[PDB]
Write a protein that binds this ligand. Structure first.
Ligand SMILES: [Cl-]
Length: 214
């Protein structure tokens, strides 16, 4: 059977997009903390999202807005990139549209300790229309909170990866997020007193239930 062993093998693969997202956020916060000007940062972020792979589909930097600015075009200054060929989108920066500093993935990281990461709920990005989960983290400059960095995980890509990996290991799996939402369910069911192997990535992190596939 080796159910526990195969469930660990699967968990290790499910961890790869997690570690991937953290690593890309570390690069983003390096760019945000740096002295590079806006144009240099745009170039480095375009390059970064060009080289990242896996389930990562979009993300960028969200500087603390200057909402007091008289000129509406100066208040928001996000640097957001979408892997369609990488496109920069400016859509979050028109003040008429509300800005970005009240989004849940921004507020979760706002003024939190550097080095902490935060999960968004599943959502469809209003401008790219990609269904996704976002990991965010704050970055600081001169000891003062400066902005939020984000990486977006494509839900479609994550599902494909988890399900394909589970199938290869002859497993069924349910993966739930920190909000109780079923991110992936592949060939998972219980009957005839089948054992379920449970693995938690953390108290408010992903949870998996694993069964043997027949
Ligand atoms: Cl699913």
């Amino acid at each position: 059977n080796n159910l526990a062993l195969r469930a660990e093998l699967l968990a290790t693969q499910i961890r790869e997009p997690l570690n991937n997202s953290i690593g890309v956020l570390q690069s983003l916060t390096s760019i945000g903390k740096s002295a590079a000007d806006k144009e240099e940062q745009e170039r480095m972020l375009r390059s970064l999202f060009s080289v990242v792979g896996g389930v990562i589909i979009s993300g960028g930097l969200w500087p603390e807005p200057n909402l007091s600015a008289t000129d509406p075009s100066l208040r928001y200054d996000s640097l957001f990139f979408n892997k369609a060929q990488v496109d920069q989108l400016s859509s979050w920066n028109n003040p008429k549209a509300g800005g970005y500093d009240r989004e849940s993935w921004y507020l979760a990281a706002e003024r939190e300790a550097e080095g902490l990461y935060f999960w968004s709920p599943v959502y469809v990005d209003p401008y790219t229309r990609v269904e996704m989960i976002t990991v965010s983290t704050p970055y600081y400059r001169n000891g003062q909170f400066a902005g939020v960095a984000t990486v977006d995980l494509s839900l479609e890509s994550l599902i494909q990866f988890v399900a394909a990996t589970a199938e290869q290991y002859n497993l069924g799996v349910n993966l739930k997020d920190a909000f109780g939402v079923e991110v992936v369910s592949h060939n998972f069911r219980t009957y005839d007193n089948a054992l379920v192997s449970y693995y938690s990535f953390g108290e408010f992190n992903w949870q998996i239930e694993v069964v043997n596939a027949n």
